[PDB]
Structure formats: C-alpha cells, structure tokens
Amino acid sequence: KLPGDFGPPRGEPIHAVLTSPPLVPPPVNRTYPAKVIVELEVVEKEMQISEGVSYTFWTFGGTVPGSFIRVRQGDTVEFHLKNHPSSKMPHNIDLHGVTGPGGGAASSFTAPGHESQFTFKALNEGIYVYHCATAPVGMHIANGMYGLILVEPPEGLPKVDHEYYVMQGDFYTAGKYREKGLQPFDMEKAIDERPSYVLFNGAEGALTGDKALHAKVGETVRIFVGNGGPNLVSSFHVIGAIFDQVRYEGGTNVQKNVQTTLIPAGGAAVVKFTARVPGSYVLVDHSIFRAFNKGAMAILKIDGAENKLVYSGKELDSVFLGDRAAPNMSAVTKATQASVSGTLTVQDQVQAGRALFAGTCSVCHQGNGAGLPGVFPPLAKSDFLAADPKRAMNIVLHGLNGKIKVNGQEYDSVMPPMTQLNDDEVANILTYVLNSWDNPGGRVSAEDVKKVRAQ
Amino acid sequence: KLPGDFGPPRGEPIHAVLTSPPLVPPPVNRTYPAKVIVELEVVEKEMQISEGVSYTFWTFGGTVPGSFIRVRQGDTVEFHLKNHPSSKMPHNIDLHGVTGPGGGAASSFTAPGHESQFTFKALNEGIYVYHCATAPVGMHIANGMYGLILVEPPEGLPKVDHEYYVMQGDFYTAGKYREKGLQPFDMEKAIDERPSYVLFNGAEGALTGDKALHAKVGETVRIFVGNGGPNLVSSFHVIGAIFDQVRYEGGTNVQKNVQTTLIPAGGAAVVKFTARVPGSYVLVDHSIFRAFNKGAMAILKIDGAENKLVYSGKELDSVFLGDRAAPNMSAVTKATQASVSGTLTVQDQVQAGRALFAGTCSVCHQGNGAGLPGVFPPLAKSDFLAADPKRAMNIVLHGLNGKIKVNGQEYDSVMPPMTQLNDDEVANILTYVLNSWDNPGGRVSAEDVKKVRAQ
Amino acid sequence: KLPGDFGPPRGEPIHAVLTSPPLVPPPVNRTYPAKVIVELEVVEKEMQISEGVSYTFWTFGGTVPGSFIRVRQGDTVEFHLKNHPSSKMPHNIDLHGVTGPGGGAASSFTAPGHESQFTFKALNEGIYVYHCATAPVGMHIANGMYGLILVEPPEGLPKVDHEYYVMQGDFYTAGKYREKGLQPFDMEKAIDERPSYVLFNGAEGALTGDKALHAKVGETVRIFVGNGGPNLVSSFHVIGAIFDQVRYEGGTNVQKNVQTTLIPAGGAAVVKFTARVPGSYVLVDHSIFRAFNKGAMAILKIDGAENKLVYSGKELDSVFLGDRAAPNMSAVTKATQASVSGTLTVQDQVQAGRALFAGTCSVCHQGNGAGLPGVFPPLAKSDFLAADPKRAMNIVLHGLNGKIKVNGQEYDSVMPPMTQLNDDEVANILTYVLNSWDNPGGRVSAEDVKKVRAQ
Ligand code: HEC
Ligand code: HEC
Ligand code: HEC
Ligand SMILES: O=N[O-]
Ligand SMILES: O=N[O-]
Ligand SMILES: O=N[O-]
Ligand SMILES: [Cu+2]
Ligand SMILES: [Cu+2]
Ligand SMILES: [Cu+2]
Ligand SMILES: [Cu+2]
Ligand SMILES: [Cu+2]
Ligand SMILES: [Cu+2]
DSSP states (O other): OTTTTTOOOOOEEEEEOBTTOOOOOOOOSSSSEEEEEEEEEEEEEEEEHHHHHHHOOOOEEESSSOOOHHHHHTTTEEEEEEEOTTTTOOOOEEETOOGGGGGGGGGOOOOOOEEEEEEEOSOEEEEEEEEEEOOSSHHHHHTOOOOEEHHHHHHHHOOOOOEEEEEEEEEEEOHHHHHHHOOOOOOHHHHTOSSSEETTTTHHHHHHHGGOEEEEOOOEEEEEEOOOOSOOOEEEEEEEEEEEEETTTTTTTOBBBBBBBEEOTTTTEEEEEOOOOOOOEEESSSSSSHHHSSSOOEEEEEEOOOOTTBBBBBOOOTSGGGGGGGOOOOOHHHHHHHHHTTTOOOHHHHHHHHHHHTTTTTTHOTTOOOEEETBBBTTTTHHHHHHHHHHHHHHHHEEEEEEEEESSSSSEEEOOTTTOOHHHHHHHHHHHHSSSSTTTOOOHHHHHHHHHHHH | OOOTTOOOOOSSSEEOOOOTTTOOOOOOOOOOOOEEEEEEEEEEEEEEEETTEEEEEEEEEESSOOBBBEETTTTTEEEEEEOOOTOOSOOOOTTTOOSSGGTGGGGGGTTTTTEEEEEEEEESSSEEEEEEEOOOOOHHHHHHHHHEEEEEEETTOOOOOOEHHHHHHHEEEESOOOEEEEEEEEEHHHHOOOOOOEEEETSSTTGGGOOOOEEEOEEEEEEEEEEEOOOOOOOETTTTTTTSSSEEESOOBBBBSSEEEETTTTTTEEEEEOOSSSSSEEEEEESHHHHHOOOOEEEEESSSSOOOBOOOOOOOOTTTTTGGGOOOOOHHHHHHHHHTOOOOHHHHHHHHHHHHHHTHHHHHHOOTOOOOOTTTTTTTTTTHHTTTTTHHHHHHHOOEEEEEEEESOEEEEEEETTTOOOOHHHHHHHHHHTSSSTOOOOOOOHHHHHHHHHO | OTTTTSSSSSOOOOOOOOOTOOOOOOOOSSSSOOOEEEEEEEEEEEEEEEETTTEEEEEEESSSSSOOOEETTTTTTEEEEEEEESSSSBOOHHHHHHHOOOGGGGOOOOTOOOEEEEEEEESSOEEEEEEOSSSHHHHHHHHOOOOEEEEEOOTOOOSSSEEEEEEEEEESSSSTTTTEEEBBOOOOHHTTOOSSSEETTTTTTTTTTGGGGEEEOOOOEEEEEEESSSEEEEEEEEEEEBBBBBEETSOOOOOBBBBEEEEEEEEEEEEEEEOOOOOOEEEEESSHHHHHOOOEEEEEEEESSOOOBBBOOOOOTTTTTGGSSSSSHHHHHHHHHHHTOOOHHHHHHHHHHHHHTTTTTTHHTTTEEEEEEBBBOOOTTTTHHHHHTHHHHHHHHHOOOEESSSSSOEEEEOOOOTTTHHHHHHHHHHHHHSTTTTTTOOOOOOHHHHHHHHH
C-alpha cells in the first residue's frame, strides 16, 4: 500500500481534544487506527501583543499559536472548521503533513458563521505547521493564523516528564516596537520582511517571569517548536543548555547535542532537553536583535539542588534579560490604561518606570541608583539631575559624553543615546528616578518628551 | 589517487547536450570516463519578468536559469564559453563542483564576440550551481546568470519517471512589483537584499497554469532545485505532499520524509517526490510573502484516480493560488501592450481585470460578484457602486469600514486597503466590475487612479 | 553520572593560553581531566574596519573575533574576566557549551577596572560561540564582542597539517560602506538587520592578499568557523574546492562533500579541507552582495605543483576578486590619512585610484586602459576624456549610453552607473586615470565629486 496505511478505522469515532499553548494533548496511547473528528473554530479578537499594546489577532481556537492537534499515523481525520460569526473575513486551513492539494485549503473555505469539512488520512508521521490559506495568505499568517499538528508514530514517542508547545512568529505593526495603543497590520513592513515584533506564543512575555515553563533537575522536557513565520527563519537557541535531540517534521535524520539550530519559515521541530542544574534557560532566535529588541525570548525555569562542580555561578538577572527578569511588567499595562482614561497619577508613572529601568538603566547606574564612583555617575540624590531635570530627557534620547561633575566627582565617559524608547517610556523612567532615592520629585509627561524629541 | 579519479578518458570525445529549463539532459548511461566538450553562449536580452513587465536578462544559453549540464564523476570537461557579439558586457563562469581557483572564473573571462576555454576533471559527484563571476558579481547574478551542473555517480542516479529543473532567484527592479514597462536593475535594493520579485525559472507564472510540470499517480519525480540567489535563502516547501528524499550538492547525508527544507544562496538540492493523489502541488519559498506577493510559486499537476480514503477534498483554486489558478494572465500582457500603442479598448481593460479579480477580490465578493448577504456586499447590480463609481477607486486603495447599505441590506465590516495594486491594476479590475453583472458600465483609466492615490 | 563527567581534576592547575585569530591554541594532548584557569581581558579601542575607516570595537583580548579558548571535555574551567580600566562600559560573557543559566552571564558582570570569576565543568564536546551578554546585548555583539571555545573529545581531534580561526560578523556604521573617518554604531540599521559591512575577522581584507591563510598541495586544513552575528545567517561557501567534512557545534551528525553550508547566527562549525591543486580558495557568505559588496571574503592560498589533468586554468585575479586580488590597499589608507592632515598630494590620489581601479574599472577598460576596439572605449590617451574631464565625474556616478566616438572609433554601448563609490573614491580613481597612459594630467577633489553628485 502507501506508507502509513494501517488499514481502515476500528472502534468508535474519537472526538479529538486540542490544547491551548503552551500545553499539548496527551499521547493517543493506542495500537489501532481510528476515525478522529476535529472541531476547530476561527476567532478574530484584540489581545495585548505587549504591555499597553493591542493588536487584532486572527486565531484558530482563540490563541496564537492556535490549538494543538494530536493524532496517530494511519488515523482518518474528519476535519471541521467553523468561522465564528463575529469574524469579518473568510478563512480555511492548510495542514502540512496532509497528502492532498492545498493540504485542505479548497475544501475548508469558510465564511463568517459557516462550518466546512474535509477528510484526510495521516500517512506521514511527524510535527507539522498548519496555517490559514486565504488570499492574501501573508496577512492571515501575520495576524496569527498558525499552529502545530503532531502525527505520532504507531508505537508513540518515548515518555518524557514534560511536553510543551512554543511557536515563533514575526509581526508587522504600523507603530514602532512598544508604541502604545491598538496597532494595525502594516503590509509595507511585511512585504519588506521588516517585523516590529518577533514573538513566541503571540506576545512579549508570553513565556517569561510568572509565565515561564517549569521542570525539575533530572527531568526530560520535549518541546514542539513551530515557526509560523510568515517570513523569518529562526536561529533557534537554548542559553545555558544543549538539546539532546532535534528532529525536523517527520525527518529520518536526528541531530544530537546541539545548542543552535535553523528553523525554516513554516518549519517545525521536536527538541529534547534534560535538566542538569537549576536556573532560567532562555529560548531565543539568536538573530540577537530579535531576541533582545523585538520580544523573541521564552524561559524554562528548573527547580532543584545546585551542582557546584558543574556550575558555580548565579541565576540569570536583568544584566542579561533586562526588564523580563521580573515576574511581569503589569505596571506598564496599568499606567497605559490610566493615560487612555486621562487618570494617570505620579504613582502610575513611578511603578511603570521602575519596571522599565531594570537592565535598560540599572546595568550601568545600578538597581539602587548608586552608580560606581569615578565610572558610572549616580542617579541617587543627584545634584547633576536636580540642577536641570529637563536635560535628563535630552540625556536619555541623545546620550551624554564629556567631562562632568556629579556629587563632587569627575566623569569623562559616554552614555549611548536610547532614541528607541517611546515618549511614555522616557517619561515614566524619569518620573520614577525623580521620585526615588531622595531626588527632587515631580513628573515628566509623554508630551514633554515628544517636544524634546522634535528639536 | 584523488577521489573521483577513474583514469584517463576512453573512446571519442562527446559533445554535451544542454537542456533549457525545466527539462534535464538524459542520463549519460555509461561505465567509462569520457572527454566531454561543453559549448555555452552568453546572451543579453529583454524578456517578460511578469505580465507587461520587461527586464534585460543576462543569460547562459538564452534562459534563466541557464542551460543544464550533465557529466559523470571522472569525466574530463573541456568548457568553451562564447559571449555573443550583441552583449555590452564581459562574462565568465564559476562552476561549483570544479577543483580549481575561481571554479574557472580567470580562464573563462570573455568579451563580447570572443570564446574562452579551460579544462577540468569532475572529481566531485553531486548537483552544483554555476554562475557568472565578473565584477560586479552581484549584478551579473541578479540579471539571471546562474544554472546547474549535475555530476553523476559512476553507476548513475536511480531511475524515476520524470526529472525537472527548477531554480529560485531574487530580482531587483527600480519599479515596484508589477509596475509595467522595461524595469532597470536597482543596485540600492540588491545591496539591501530587498527584492521586488522572487521567482522560479526567471518569471512570474514560469511554472503555473498551462506551464505546470506534469506527472501521473504512482510516478516518481526527481527535481533538481537551485538557489541562484543572489541574496535569499529559500525555505523550500511542497504544499500538499512530502519529499521522499532531499540531498544537498554531493553530501553523504540524505534527509527523508520532510516537507520544508532550507536552501542556501548558491545551494542546490535533488528532491524526490512520489505522486499519491491527483491535484496541483505547489513549490514555494515558505517565507510566505515571497510565495504569495513576489511570484515564488511553481506547480506540479498530477493526473489519475481520486483516493477518497486518503483525501476527500477539492483541487486547489483561486482562494489559495489567487490569480495563478487560471491557465495564464495573457489578458494583462495584451492590455499593457495596447496602453503603450495608445489603442487600449474597454474590452482590453475588462479581460485584464477579470484575470486580476480572481482571489484578489473573488475571495470575499465571489466569482460572480454575488457576495454573501449580511457578510460580504455584492458588486453584482450594486446600487452602492452605481451611486458613485469614482469612490470605488478610494475603496480599493484605502479600504472601507463602517455601517453601509447595499441592495437594501446592512453591513458593518472591514475591507482592507489594497495600495499594493498598481494604477493600471485598480483601473482594469474596476472597469471589469462596471462592465459585468448588469452594472452601469463605463471605464476607469490608470490616470484617474493616479490622481486618487495622490490625495 | 552526567555525560562528560570523567571525575575530578588531576595534577597541577593549567593556565590556559588563548590565541589571536586566525591562529588556534595547540591540542591539549592529555588523557586526564584538569582544572584550567582562563584569564580574558575586555578592551575597547578604535581599529580600521576598512581602509581609512575607523570603528570603536569592544573586544575580548584585543581582537575581533576575541581570543580562542581550548579545553578538554571533562575539564573544570575557572574563568576570570577582567574589564580594562580604559573601558567606558560594563561587560560579561555567555559561553555556548556551558551548562548553567546565562552560560556565565550573571556571575561574570564586570565594571571597568574590575575582575569577575565563575567555575564550570565542560560537559559538552564541540565548537561553541562565546559573546558579551550585557544590556543592550545587540550593541555589545555588533561592536565585536564574540569568539570561539573548543571543547575537545577526550581522545582529541584527528591530526591535520593546519588549524585556523575564522569568524563572520555583521556590522552597523552610521556612514555608508567605505565612507571614511571614525564611524559610530547605528542602532537603526542593526534593529533592521541592514548591515553596512559583513566581515571575517573584524575588517575588510583581514584575510586577503598578504594576510591570506596558507597551506601546500596534499595538506589537510581544519577551519573553526564562527558566526558572531549579531543578525545574519551565513551561506558559508568555499570557491573552487569542497569541504571533506562539516560538523556543527558538538553535533553527532557530520556532513561530507559539500561546498555550501548554512551557519546560524551564534552558530559555529569545524570544516576540513584537503589541498588538491594550487591557487587562491575564497571563503564567502554566498548571499553574494555580502561577499562582493560588504567585505565577506577570506582567502586560503595553496602552494605546489599544477595538476593540468584536474584543472588547466589560471589563478584567481581582479575580474572576480576585484580590488582584493592585490596584496593590500595601503595606498587608500595613506591617501585618507593625508586628507585628514590637509597634505593630500596628486601622487597620494594616484596610488589610491590605482588600487581601487582594479576590477571596478579594469574588468571593461583593462589594466592598461587600452579597452577593446569597438566594444570597450580606451581610457589610455583618450580624446573623449581630454575634451571634458569634468564629465568623467558624471560618467562614473550616473553611467553612459548612446553612440560616442573615442580615438576615432564608434561605440554604441552602456556603462552602468557606480553611485556606490564615495566622493574620495571617484576623485582618486579619476586622478589616477588623468595621470596615467599620457592623459592630460591634473586632479579631481572629493569636493568636486560632491557637487556633481548633488545635481
Ligand atoms: C551605560 C552603559 C549606561 C546606561 C545603560 C545608562 N546610562 Fe546614564 N549615564 C551613563 C554615563 C557613563 C554617564 C556619564 C556620561 C559622561 O559624560 O561622563 C551617564 C549620565 C547620566 C545622567 C546625568 C548624570 C547624573 O544625573 O548622574 C543621567 C540623568 C542618566 N545618565 C540617566 C540614565 C537613565 C535614566 C538611563 C536609562 C534610561 C541611563 N542613564 C542609562 C551610563 C549609562
Ligand atoms: C474581504 C477580505 C474583501 C476583499 C478581498 C475585497 N473586498 Fe470589497 N468589500 C469587502 C467588505 C466587507 C466590504 C464592506 C465594508 C463595510 O464597511 O462593511 C467591501 C466593500 C466594497 C465595495 C463597496 C460596496 C459595494 O459596492 O458592494 C466595493 C465597490 C468593493 N468592496 C470592491 C472590491 C474590489 C474591487 C476588490 C478587489 C480589488 C475588493 N472589494 C476586495 C470585503 C472585501
Ligand atoms: C563595463 C562593464 C564597464 C565598467 C566596469 C566601467 N566602464 Fe567606463 N565605459 C564603459 C563603456 C561601454 C563605455 C562606453 C559607453 C557608450 O555609450 O558606448 C564607457 C565609457 C567611459 C568613459 C568615456 C569614454 C572614454 O573616455 O574612453 C570614461 C571616462 C569611463 N568609461 C571611465 C570609467 C571608469 C573611471 C570606470 C571605473 C570607475 C569605468 N569606466 C568602469 C564600460 C565600463
Ligand atoms: O547564548 N546566548 O545568546
Ligand atoms: O503549505 N503552504 O504554505
Ligand atoms: O562560487 N562562488 O561564488
Ligand atoms: Cu484566515
Ligand atoms: Cu504552509
Ligand atoms: Cu556576466
Ligand atoms: Cu558561487
Ligand atoms: Cu560587552
Ligand atoms: Cu548566545
């Protein structure tokens, strides 16, 4: 027969359970081919792509990436696609792994309010991307319309202690990175493959802080990793560890002991990890400006005993992770909501700047503003800042070099410009500094920073 | 000895036959090393890169990609390169697979009207890119100067039912995608790696519609896939199938059962496919905006019996392929030629818009303009369009949201802007709508759309 | 135990020797695990990124890439990081291959004047990138803060005749490629992944001409290849040869007989080469505009007997390598220093243009300016140039087409524009032509070309 043909379906039809990221449906745990029924519903909706930044996502099952599907090589899959009547657009699905033109696209076209169905046999074992396939295909995929389908080998995968679901995507907003408000899709930036954000699981901090993945020393972790694109190839990397194994789609070839691996646009791989020592392990795109300037990091946090003979050093902090070392940045969300209301208090700006000050500023000036005598001027009880706080907006946007004196000490150094910070971010950071460590006090508005930018 | 040394050439010299894409010279089918003579002639010439879009290609043997060369590991290759006296530039060749500095570049320098020769032994088995190697190398390669050379293993490749030749390239026009006329090379866009088109076999639709590759259910297909670049890496993908095998250059490593595979700039791979069920199978760069916005699709069309137990669904259509589902878009070519002549009739604009309307517009408004009551307003006998057809130019360029009434029915939806359409494309699409389904009639000029763009 | 655990350290502590690129520390040549002490010192300093182009590099041990580290799987590594008191910034290190959060980042934070230490066991065999891990991480990496660490298998690597150290990086200057002076870092270009230079070993010509790598026919060469990024993936290619072997990090999978191989951002591979025939072998990023327009070439020069039966052709020259065929371009460095001094002589401009004229101009007009009668007009004793030398600035910046007459011969051809040349480059090239082959003489200033650009 064809390969993957294990005969016709036995027993009762199975209604497939799909999971929201970062979780995975359990092993099918069976020795016979089945008829599997899949209900998947498209929903269009605003969600936070970043703190105080809203985006209209188009989703399979309400999430980016969309719901995870798990079947067995040889299963017969009756695939129903519903387009929720709130949707303004039509949608369909192309599943990689499907043998058939469009991988289902033609038979799955679905207007708002309608349901579609088509049937396919899962001939090919492996991990596979699925995505919308509706003109214009790039826009559907950029708005979040992708996920994974696992087709298990008949004997199933080897048992591990944890299975997780992580999917990278490149996103195209009209506004610049961390510009606040509802951000429309930007076709220009997408055609040019110049994304404003590059994200795991549909948002900045989706898998950092309180939202990290978890395992214990001695446990094995399997991650199903997708690249939804639409455009970027991922230099997919784990910081501080190594993958025991990396297997692309249903490839016969299996790479072992690598830390860095290229994932094509539309590609998917299964990686295996064994926790050897505790701490935060970062998943990134090692096209480093994606990781550190566009949101492309996810954390795996390991619990257990130190092993001083393998690694003597300290847990990850804000020197490396910057503002994502913290549990969350809800203070930024809260301050942004207040601006929209017109009820922005000084305390709102202070708790938001406190969040944003980590790494961004603390790497030189320290957590406590103390600085380092002769090398990094203090921000704590600072005569320099007191003397002219309006110049602090210029110092942040445009930088500072030359000899200067601060609390009667000489500095001849360089503070790089930080023009990438948005007006609200400069304002809140500075309002926190002024209201910390016995400084003058007061406040800096977004409006004040806008004026100084424009000169 | 060296590896690949099977002794000196036996028998008479063989004059090598080269094929034009997408065809491949036949298997050398011999057990002895030979002296192979290769005559390859460079030609500069305008060809259509897209409908009504002309480009000055620099070519090896009159095609992009250039003529395919097939020899045997151990052969001695006497390589003659002629530069046609019409050429304005000098040219040479670097063949990957050649052991020797420049892979032939120095000894093959050839001014217009001249012939060059150099001899090399084919030590390395595999599939290899060749390209021009003349300062400035990027310009020669961007203008189309690349192809493939197969060096067979001594026992030859395994027999398959079909062998085809597909080569991706990134192209850099002064004008934007589908801007009509003769388009010069743009050095700025090339240096920035921002291509206007991304193409298989030197043009949009080179391998779609009437120009698809063909096989029958049960047949094996081998594709020799090149990436000429100059700059892009291809996330090379088959929609709706799987590659039995992928082998890069003359690599010992062979990947099996993958759908998605990274091809480096200057890389080449051999993929094997087995037809299981009939329909169109799309080859793409799954950096999706290349595939769907810049021309990076090719079709393999399979004939034979449905297998309802493997795949129940319908053949690919314009929901997914958009305007390339059709056999061709000659109507666009014909209307563009008419504009240049100043003899553009209403019928010319109508048949051109009819072509362009598929997917672009039909995905929401339907093939027949009917729309879907309450969800997608009709274009068919439309009071809304009748009431002010000049506003239709604004609706296409800039989009439409809000409550509206069309043939006495309420719509509160969103039609995305389509500013990417060129003036001629908006004009012809709208002229087709006006002259279809009992609408007012009339015509929209490119000149009319230009004015509305500029406001 | 863990894998790589060969017990506790025996014998005396070893003080590790680190080498500057392109050299490599010798094999550890031992059968027991050791305690290895590593002293590495960060230095900030201006160096030439290109002729007459200065950049403030941040370096590990004074070089880009930074000093090479060589230890044995199972060694215990006491890692000391010093930040020289001249530094204006703090720094730390993340080593790929380290089992531990941040791969050392947290425990290695080091202000100007300070020393840090942390200890790790080398559990994982392979070749690994190390880099700075200090907010903002992208800037530290773009300024040159990366190198390699080899962790040998216990039995060591196989013996080869030569081992070399080559590392690619993408660089982001405010000024355009080969714009002269001290060039600041450009955050905009880095975030957009639009590098101005793409370099092996921290500069244009770092490994070309007099600075090429060397081997003899019959010798094996191992290259440790790094991609520091920060952003680019390398289509890493050897022109005119083949890699016997390519192995990524400590991967079990080993590819054999390939010419072209993708290296991820942050990736590293070990390639093996065997010299079969003499000549220059070029290492490139086959994203060709990096190689030929941004500095991404390195040369391996092989000495020994011709083998006419394998390759009949000539050594690489300026048709392919352009201005890098020569031993150096010191004349460009010397002329640029003179402009800064205000002591720029006619002879300074002539020797600088002579350097720059190779490939750029000589590919059509020839080394001697003779041209080719009827095809390429001469520059040698040229009536056309004599008649109006001020028009030569326009011809270079903007090109020339149409019928023309030169030394009483007709030409109807096309000379492409060369607007990419900087004002100083046009001026020096033209001053060389005027003062060569019995031409009028005189000089063209950078200031003259600036005026003609602006019209
Ligand atoms: C190092 C990498 C720094 C980062 C990150 C930030 N700052 Fe800084 N800052 C730095 C230096 C070396 C200097 C002195 C420059 C000189 O000419 O010698 C400064 C200076 C300031 C000042 C003025 C002096 C003072 O008030 O003590 C201010 C107000 C200041 N810096 C604020 C500041 C903020 C708010 C930061 C993050 C947004 C920030 N700095 C980052 C070094 C570095
Ligand atoms: C959905 C994804 C659409 C595509 C693709 C195109 N159109 Fe559309 N159009 C769409 C909607 C939802 C609406 C109503 C918007 C609202 O505010 O509710 C429209 C509206 C129009 C109109 C005006 C109404 C009418 O005449 O019936 C016109 C003239 C129109 N659209 C034309 C049009 C053309 C020519 C298209 C391709 C070039 C096109 N539309 C694409 C939804 C979608
Ligand atoms: C071919 C690929 C060329 C390169 C590279 C360069 N030039 Fe050229 N040049 C070329 C042609 C075909 C022509 C004639 C154009 C026509 O209309 O037929 C020219 C012309 C000139 C001229 C004017 C004629 C003359 O003086 O002989 C000059 C002064 C000239 N070219 C200079 C020049 C320089 C300085 C170059 C490098 C910087 C250069 N050319 C490159 C073809 C080509
Ligand atoms: O390994 N860190 O980028
Ligand atoms: O599988 N389609 O993009
Ligand atoms: O093989 N040369 O680009
Ligand atoms: Cu969709
Ligand atoms: Cu896909
Ligand atoms: Cu050429
Ligand atoms: Cu090449
Ligand atoms: Cu640093
Ligand atoms: Cu790293």
